[PDB]
Amino acid sequence: SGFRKMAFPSGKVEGCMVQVTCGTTTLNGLWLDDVVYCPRHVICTSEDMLNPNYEDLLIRKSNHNFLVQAGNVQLRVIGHSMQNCVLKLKVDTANPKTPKYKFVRIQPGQTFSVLACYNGSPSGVYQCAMRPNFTIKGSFLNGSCGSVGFNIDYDCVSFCYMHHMELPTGVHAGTDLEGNFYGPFVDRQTAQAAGTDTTITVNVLAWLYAAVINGDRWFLNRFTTTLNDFNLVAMKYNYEPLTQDHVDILGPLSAQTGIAVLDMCASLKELLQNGMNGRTILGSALLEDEFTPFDVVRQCS
Amino acid sequence: SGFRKMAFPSGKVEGCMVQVTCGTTTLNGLWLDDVVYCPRHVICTSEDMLNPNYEDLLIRKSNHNFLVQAGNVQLRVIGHSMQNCVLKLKVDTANPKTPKYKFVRIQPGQTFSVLACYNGSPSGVYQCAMRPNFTIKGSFLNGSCGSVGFNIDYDCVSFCYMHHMELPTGVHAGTDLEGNFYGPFVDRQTAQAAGTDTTITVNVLAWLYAAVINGDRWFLNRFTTTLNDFNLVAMKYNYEPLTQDHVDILGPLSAQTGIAVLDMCASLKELLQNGMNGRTILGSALLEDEFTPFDVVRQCS
Numbered sequence A, B: 001s002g003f004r005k006m007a008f009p010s011g012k013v014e015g016c017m018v019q020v021t022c023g024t025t026t027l028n029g030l031w032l033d034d035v036v037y038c039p040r041h042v043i044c045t046s047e048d049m050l051n052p053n054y055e056d057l058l059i060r061k062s063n064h065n066f067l068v069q070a071g072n073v074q075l076r077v078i079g080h081s082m083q084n085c086v087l088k089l090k091v092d093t094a095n096p097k098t099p100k101y102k103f104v105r106i107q108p109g110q111t112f113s114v115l116a117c118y119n120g121s122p123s124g125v126y127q128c129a130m131r132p133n134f135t136i137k138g139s140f141l142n143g144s145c146g147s148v149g150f151n152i153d154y155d156c157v158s159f160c161y162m163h164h165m166e167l168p169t170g171v172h173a174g175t176d177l178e179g180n181f182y183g184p185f186v187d188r189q190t191a192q193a194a195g196t197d198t199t200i201t202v203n204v205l206a207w208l209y210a211a212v213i214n215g216d217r218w219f220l221n222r223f224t225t226t227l228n229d230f231n232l233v234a235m236k237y238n239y240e241p242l243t244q245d246h247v248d249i250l251g252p253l254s255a256q257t258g259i260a261v262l263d264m265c266a267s268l269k270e271l272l273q274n275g276m277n278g279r280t281i282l283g284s285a286l287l288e289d290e291f292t293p294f295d296v297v298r299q300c301s
């Protein structure tokens, strides 16, 4: 019983966090086997933030310009290279704490855990979702760059996010672990701003199933809807279209609760049109969209 | 920027989780130095749940009736003893991953991280608060007993909670690590139920300061209030009394934002009396009370 924003246990990722310093710039890196990954803007000088040519900046560096510290131990850099917007620092020691891992890029609407770090030291763990506009609503302060996002499945860490910047609205942008940005953001000074966002409909429906599994039933009704008629309502309320694949993915939660997916859609339509009339679902007075169907199944009975 | 329900990194606690089996009952234990701690109801037989005499149940046991597994390694039990509602199983191996730790009992209104576990294997981490009625609104399934709650300060884990049961409303009850229950709950079959709860006023005020630090200002006003006049409003809305100590504890957040505590109280009074008129604070449409002043300071700029 209960339903919380739950992250994956962070220990396997804690043992990978290091501090990378270049000049007077310090941020976090990720140490896997004998490579340390970090945002390439660690080599950016405050003099040309407008259009850094990173190829130029990096050719002017040697290995000894990179200070890597794992706890109280300094790691000798023996190679450096750029991959898209990430730097790869080869070190002379393989991390003995390297978990089984993968680099996976996630979709908008999928969730992951973030281990926020400062000066290579982990400070907290929380759950986040990739928004439809490829930002994340994180919690990060200055120096958090290089903190990572990840999911864990049977002892294997799938890294999906490395933090690079805060946008003007206070939301966050970064890359996958191959250095490729999520969304149109760039690691150079621009008035870049998050494009218009939408609500993740399949996740709101998953969360309504969580609520029914946990005994919140007040929002149910005897009605059904067609997919097409529901999607006309979704569009009006800035919700993403619900696809037949989404309906199929919600199949197990449907079967467990005995509520057809299009019957739940009729409830969501009524909540969008009427509001909640001062009631709450799973302790929230708004419709929550940062739990996937997988998240609900993992957490709920 | 941003404000999330953030837990402490869980690695130091993951390395302490083990599985304890007695008969056909399995739950989690906590392995620190050469002792494993777990709920004593692991020795309860389904035949007398009504008034188990645990002293009797334990005298009838030997060391070999306790199976302790740390990962894939079985730990030899060499001593067993009861302390209040916890069992202490002495094993022949000190946990090499034991962190610096303390056993601390927390107050209602204080927060902590929970590492939910099943069969000695960690599954997720989340943040929780001790409610004024000494329950916690956790997320736990069958077999979660023995999962712990904790805070971390400069490499030292202060354990404050061990999970023992779900109450009929779906909230959770357990003990400190000395085996003493939080609240009036008992590890025997009763219609025990959570007593009436209240909202943690000092934490709501801390969270309004977080919102101002993060640029949500719409709820501020030019008014002030006296402490006595605010507390008359608090009582009406089932909020805890605000003490002068609470006002003092909010001093740093007051100073950083330039908003006097009693000025923020005037805003909270207006939010209680008027509602939010369809607006949100820090992504919530209700007043959040599970962030302490310390939590806000740790997370915010």
Ligand SMILES: *CC(=O)N1CCN(c2nc(NC)nc(N[C@@H](CCO)c3ccccc3Cl)n2)C[C@H]1C(=O)NCCC(N)=O
Pocket (backbone or CB within 6 Å): A027, A041, A044, A049, A050, A141, A142, A143, A144, A145, A146, A163, A164, A165, A166, A167, A186, A187, A188, A189, A190, A191, A192
């Ligand atoms: C992750 C982290 O700890 N960061 C983000 C990067 N960094 C920073 N500082 C400043 N000060 C002027 N400016 C930037 N500008 C961004 C572009 C935004 O358009 C930039 C510019 C050049 C190269 C790379 C980048 Cl990301 N970046 C310090 C620090 C931080 O959190 N800064 C807050 C603002 C931000 N845009 O991240």
Ligand SMILES: *CC(=O)N1CCN(c2nc(NC)nc(N[C@@H](CCO)c3ccccc3Cl)n2)C[C@H]1C(=O)NCCC(N)=O
Pocket (backbone or CB within 6 Å): B027, B041, B044, B049, B050, B141, B142, B143, B144, B145, B146, B163, B164, B165, B166, B167, B186, B187, B188, B189, B190, B191, B192
């Ligand atoms: C933590 C955990 O994994 N638990 C909780 C304890 N346990 C359980 N099962 C059952 N089945 C009938 N009953 C109880 N009763 C509680 C008292 C509630 O009044 C009890 C009775 C005797 C001794 C100790 C206790 Cl806690 N407990 C299984 C399992 C679980 O989560 N059960 C759900 C219900 C509950 N009360 O925890």
